[model samples]
Target chain A: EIASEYLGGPGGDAFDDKAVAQNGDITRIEMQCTDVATYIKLRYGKVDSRQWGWGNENCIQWSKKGEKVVHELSSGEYITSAIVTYGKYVQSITFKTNKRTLPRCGTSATEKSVTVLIPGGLKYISGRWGCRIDGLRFHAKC
Target chain B: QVASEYLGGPGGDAFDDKALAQNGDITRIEMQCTDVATYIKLRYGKVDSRQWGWANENCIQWSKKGVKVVHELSSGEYITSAIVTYGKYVQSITFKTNKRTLPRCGTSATEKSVTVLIPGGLKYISGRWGCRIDGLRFHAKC
Candidate 1:
C-alpha cells in the first residue's frame, strides 16, 4: 500500500517555478517515503498561497507569523541519524525528544522528520506517494 | 489544527471495543499531539509507491510485511537537515515491493485532518496517536 503527497519547496536548488512560487531559501526537503518505512510529508504555506496544512510541531516562533500552517517536524541526525535501507541495515539507535517524545521542535540537531501541513485542497493526493526521509536514506517521487 | 480519535475491536483494544466472538487482534493507539499534529494515513492497494513528479521529493510505502508507526515528534533544532517536521507516523522509507506493492487496503487508519478516502472505501485508524504512525495498509473496499 503506497499513497503519497508532499509539497515542501524552496530546497537546495532547482525546481524553479519562481523558485517554487516565491520564498526559495529553505535549502532542503526530500519527501517520498514509499511502501515501507522511510518518511516524508513536509508541508508549507504562503509560498504564495494555495492553503496547505500541518506545520507547527510546537512553535515558540518561526517567522511566518509563528508559521501556523505547521507541519510539525525536526530533522538532521545527519538526516535524522541517517539510514540506508535500500536492502536494510542502517540501524543506529540513539533517538530522543522531550515535550513528551517530541511535540514541537526541541532537543536540537537540525531537526529531521516531524509531520504537519494541516490545511487542505491539495489538488490530487490520490493514493498518494511522495517522500523525503533523510534517515533510512529516502527520496521518492520526482 | 489536529484532533482525531478512532477505535477498533478485538485485541486492538481501542477504548476497548466490545469484543464478541471473532478475536481479530489489532491493538491500541492514542493521540493528542497537544495543540495538534496527530497522524495515520495508509492506503494499501494498487501500489505506485512513488510519483510526485515535476520536482523530485517523493516516496510511499505501507505494510503487509511492515508496520510500526508511532510518533508525536517535536525533537527540536528547527529540524531541517534538508527538511524536517515533527511527528506523525506512516513511514515507508524504501518503497513497497513484491513488484512495487500497491493493492490492498484494510487494516488501520487515522488522521489529524486530511481526508481523501473515496477510492475503495477501505479503513484503518484503529486508535492510537501521539506517534504510533500506522495507517498505510489499505484494502477494505468491496
Candidate 2:
C-alpha cells in the first residue's frame, strides 16, 4: 500500500516521496488531511530524468475539511502525491493507498531543496518536510 | 467506448470530454492522435463541481508525436481527456478510450467555443500527436 502524512506550520517535510511500486501495480488509494491541501498523482514511465505523472489534469486532492478518501486502482498503475501550498499555509495530513514497494533499485537523487514562501515571516514560514518510499508511513515531525 | 477525430487548418473543436464510468469505475484506457496535444483525465466524484481527477495526479497526454498509447485503469477509477493545440495549425487527431458514455444526465455545458490561434495566418507550426480513451475513438472533425 502507498501512503504519506503531511504536517505543516512550524514543521513540514521539504523532502517529497512519490514511491515507485515493486510489482508496478496500484489498486486503491486513501487520503485525509487538515488545514493543508494535498495533490496526489500517478507515474507511468520515465523520460530523460523526469517522471511525468499523467499530465496536468489528473491530480487527486485533499482539502482542510478532514475527510478520508479511499480509491481503488486496477492494474498497470503507480502512485504519488504533491503538497503544494495554495493560498493557505499548511497543516497535518495522512494518506494510505494500496501500492507495493520497489525493493530492487538504487535510490534516486536526494538533495536539500528550498521552498520559498511568499509572505515570508513567522506565521507563513514553515520548517522542513521529510519523506520515505516503500509504503512506509512518513509523518511530519513538527 | 468513446472516439473523436479533429481536423486541421484554422478549424477545430473546443469540446472537452470528461467521461465518467458506469457508477464511476474505469478499467483500462487507450489513445492515439496527431497535430495536437490532448490532456485526458478520469473523474471520481464532484467536490464542488471539480473532478477529483485534477485533485489526483492522473492524466493521459498526447503531444506532437503521433504514437499510440494504451493504458489500463484498475478499479475505483473513472476517466476523461481534453484536446489542446500546440503552436499553430493542424491536420487531424483522434481520441479513443474505454470508459462508458456520459449517460443520459444533466447537460454540463455544450456550446460553440472559440480556440484562438496567434498571428491569424499560418506557420506557428507543429505536427504528430495521438490519443485514445476507452474503446470508442473520437476523431476531431476539423
Candidate 3:
C-alpha cells in the first residue's frame, strides 16, 4: 500500500489508523465540527476505531455548537477521493465513493482546497490532531 | 486481477485492450472531444491500442470540431482510477494516477457519472464505441 503526503498544518499528536476488515473496507465514518473539524471516527466492518481529534469535553467546549455528520457505505463500496478544505488546520472534507459522493463534513469555507486521490482505493487515514484536525493523509492499496 | 463492469449506454461495438505482459503500464492516453467524447486511444509502453472511435473523418466532417487531448505519464506514474460521465455517449472523463488527477476531457454535463477503481492498480481499459465512446471499464492488477 502507498500513503499520500500529509496535508494541513503542523500541530497536535500524530495518529495512524488502518481498516482491519479482511477486504480493508471502511464501513462508516463519523465527524463533528463547527467552523473547523473537531472530531472524526472510522469504523471497519464491526469494529469502531478511536476518535481522531478531540472527542471529549474539550471538543464540545471548543466548538461551542457543532453538528455530527455520519456516512455509511453499502457492501462493496469504497472511497475513491477526498476533497479537502484546509488552512492552518484541516477544515473540512468531502468524500467521493465508488457508489456516490458523501456529504461534506465540517465547514465549507477554508483558505485552501485540494483533491486527494490515491492509486487504489482509500484504505487508511493518518494525520495529526488535537482540539481540531491539524493534518491528514490518505493510504491506498497498490 | 479484477475487471470492473462496463459503464455507459449500449450503442456501439465492443473492444478490449489489456496490458497482460509483466510491468505493462499505460504510458499515454489521447482523447478527442467537443460536447461529448468522439475518440479515445491508449498507449501501453511503446505499443498503441486500436482507436476507439472515429477521430478525424466522421468527427470533423460532422462539424463537431472536437479538440484532441493528450495525457502522458512520467516515469513511475500509473493510473489508479477514472471517473466517466456518460449517457448515450461519453460526455467527459477524468483520470487519477498515484501522483495527480489529470484535467477532465470533454463537457461536464452528462446523464450519469461512474468511478472506476479497484484494490490494486489499474492495468487496462475496455469499452464499446462507435462514432463516439459508448462505454468504459477498468481492469486492475492485484
Q: Between candidates 2 and 3, which one is better according to DockQ? A: 3
Cα lDDT tens digits, model 3, A20-93, are 54535788888886776676777877777678877467556656536787888888877776777777788888
- What lDDT tens digits, residue by residue, belong to model 1 across residues B1-142? 1111221112211211212102321122222122212233322222211111111112122222223242221221111111111124432211122122222222332322222221111222233222322222221111
lDDT (Cα, tens digit) per residue for candidate 3, span B1-142: 3456567878889988864324367788898867767778888877778778774485566537478888888877877667788877777888888788987877765666666543344677788987778888776653
Sort the candidates on TM-score, descending order: 3, 2, 1
DockQ of 3: 0.10
Candidate No. with top TM-score: 3
* Regions of model 3 farther than 4 Å from truth: A18-25, A55-65, A72-77, A107-120, B1-23, B29-40, B50-54, B57-75, B79-142
Model 2 C-alpha lDDT per residue in residues A8-49, reported as the tens digit of each score: 333233433333433233344433332332322222232111
Give me the iRMSD of candidate 3, please: 6.7
Real contacts recovered, all predictions: 0.02, 0.00, 0.04
Report each candidate's C-alpha RMSD, comma-separated, in the order given. Answer: 20.4, 20.6, 6.1
Q: Which candidate is the best by lDDT?
A: 3
Q: How does each model score on lDDT?
A: 0.22, 0.25, 0.73
Q: Taking chain A of candidate 3, what TM-score results?
A: 0.87
DockQ of each: 0.03, 0.01, 0.10
Model 1 misplacement above 4 A: A1-7, A13-100, A106-142, B1-95, B107-142
- lDDT of candidate model 1 versus the reference: 0.22
